Write a protein that binds this DNA or RNA. Sequence first.
RNA 1: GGGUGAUUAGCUCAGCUGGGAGAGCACCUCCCUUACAAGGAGGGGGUCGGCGGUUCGAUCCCGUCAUCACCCACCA
RNA 2: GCUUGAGUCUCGUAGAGGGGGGUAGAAUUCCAGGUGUAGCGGUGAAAUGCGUAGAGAUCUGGAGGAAUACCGGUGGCGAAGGCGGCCCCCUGGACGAAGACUGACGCUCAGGUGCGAAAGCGUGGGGAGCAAACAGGAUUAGAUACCCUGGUAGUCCACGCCGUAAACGAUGUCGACUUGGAGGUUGUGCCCUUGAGGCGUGGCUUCCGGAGCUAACGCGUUAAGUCGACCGCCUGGGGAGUACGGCCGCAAGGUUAAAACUCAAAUGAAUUGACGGGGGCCCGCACAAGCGGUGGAGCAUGUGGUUUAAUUCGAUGCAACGCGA
Lengths: 116, 135
Amino acid sequence: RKQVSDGVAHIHASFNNTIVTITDRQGNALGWATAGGSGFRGSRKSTPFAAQVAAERCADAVKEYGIKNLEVMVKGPGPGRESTIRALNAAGFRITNITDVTPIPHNGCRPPKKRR
Amino acid sequence: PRRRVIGQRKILPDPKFGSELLAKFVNILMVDGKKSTAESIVYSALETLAQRSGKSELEAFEVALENVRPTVEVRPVRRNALAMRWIVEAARKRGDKSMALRLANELSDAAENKGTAVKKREDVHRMAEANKAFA
RNA sequence: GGGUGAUUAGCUCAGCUGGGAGAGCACCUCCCUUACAAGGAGGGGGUCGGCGGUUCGAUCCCGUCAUCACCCACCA
RNA sequence: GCUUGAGUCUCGUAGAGGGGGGUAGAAUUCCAGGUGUAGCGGUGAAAUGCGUAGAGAUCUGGAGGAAUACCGGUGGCGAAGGCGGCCCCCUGGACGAAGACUGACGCUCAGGUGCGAAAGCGUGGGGAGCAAACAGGAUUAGAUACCCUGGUAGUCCACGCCGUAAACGAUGUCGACUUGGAGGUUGUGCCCUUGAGGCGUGGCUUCCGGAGCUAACGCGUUAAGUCGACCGCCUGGGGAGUACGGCCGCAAGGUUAAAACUCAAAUGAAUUGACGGGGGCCCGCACAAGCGGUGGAGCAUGUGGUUUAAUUCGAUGCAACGCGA
Ligand SMILES: [Mg+2]
Ligand SMILES: [Mg+2]
Ligand SMILES: [Mg+2]
Ligand SMILES: [Mg+2]
Ligand SMILES: [Mg+2]
Ligand SMILES: [Mg+2]
Ligand SMILES: [Mg+2]
Ligand SMILES: [Mg+2]
Ligand SMILES: [Mg+2]
Ligand SMILES: [Mg+2]
């Protein structure tokens, strides 16, 4: 309910999965969906079509909460940066702003020396 | 063809109904070069199905081709070639007596189109609209 | 011999108001998987633990048996 | 005695040069919440792990540790190791500007002394990340490894210790001499700065290259050309930078440094091929799409093998097996 009439979409696209979470500007959330949360566990869950169909399920089940326009917040590289707002304007609802809020430490904590 | 394009050297159409598609079909159902014992079974099965459908002749299998047409694996030439191949190799498995009648029962179940032809179609057609990632 | 949940596909099991019982894990057979992974496809051995009681309708609730399994068990 | 080699003064300039002290911001993790529900994360694919006790995500408030994006660049400083947020205190160097000042004071330097990355060691802290040893899950035939999940010593600081490397430019130090080209940095004498610019002279660095030199690759005013001084070092591979003795030390180990024994090669560069689970470009029924077959049934032929008196001999991956017939 509550007729919020404005929203915030956090997205986090990893190298193997994408998550989408819906909230207000104030941080309390409504609903969320993952690329894992549409089936196909494993390799195929990191795909942009999976990301947009996860957005299809994500816009579902938050429908009755009264949302028209929203802002976009983007974390992590991959396919989720590019195949989510296509599903969102397939839903048609207008985008206020798109923000890349990918966390960048200024070469702070030491990463692994991985990938041999 | 690492190098060349097709020219698709053509053939002669059907004698009676004049369909180049039916000529390609009797080329399909042909084994060891027998158009005559192909076409006797073909025209006998088609003249059974015309009575058993109560409709025209060419639309009676235009329906039976469109409803067994898949999407991908794709180009329409391979679509309407694999469709006829599917009907033949579907009727090959049936436990009936003769080839024309097992083809007729296959086309009947492809008329009330939950037949073994669309059963064979809807595995690759099931991968379609379920694995739409690859490009 | 006392209480209650409980006995249901091969398994633990789960879905309930007197209305259309199963998603997942296991067994054997193909296109694809270069091959074993993955995928869909269609392959199933409910007599829902038994008897009777029901209402214009039973896994559905009740009476008992049987039977895996939880609590405490006297003083004299 | 002289002043050109080194040195001083005055003005300056650039700079992650060094030691100490403090501070700021993004982020990882942890603590406590609020929202919100069935997953998060992981790989080539899976699994261990966290999650209905509510994870991941998500907004806030806090704690603590470490390193400072972008500027950043064959850009600068230092003799070498090396040094990056900002500010403050102390401090060493390089270069430029014309003068003034002493008068060969200089070069090199075994032994000597000092510095010296990372790992480690003793003592006291701190411990957020990352991570040797370890445990589990994976792969595998096997996996004491590559991958994942964690995670102790360690990486930080204070003081001390061993003083090692592909510590490289595999090129010791100083001074001078013989053509060029294009950059980057930092100075100063000048230009109507009357145009971000361009003109000379200095310092340093990076690249292409002439003669020369070298066995070739290549070096190429910063030489591996031409000289001069001084020092360290090599004498075939292997034993071996091992032992024995000494010196050093908490040990780990370092430094100096042999002999017997064995071989006639070991190596540097370069050429021509071959190969590459090296790249680019192609070609073929090589593969994909088809269609019909074999291997499974009975028989013909042939090989291997066995036994027999002999089962004549030859051919053996394709490219021998209805072959010499
Ligand atoms: Mg200074
Ligand atoms: Mg150290
Ligand atoms: Mg310690
Ligand atoms: Mg690791
Ligand atoms: Mg050494
Ligand atoms: Mg050169
Ligand atoms: Mg020389
Ligand atoms: Mg030794
Ligand atoms: Mg060589
Ligand atoms: Mg093929």
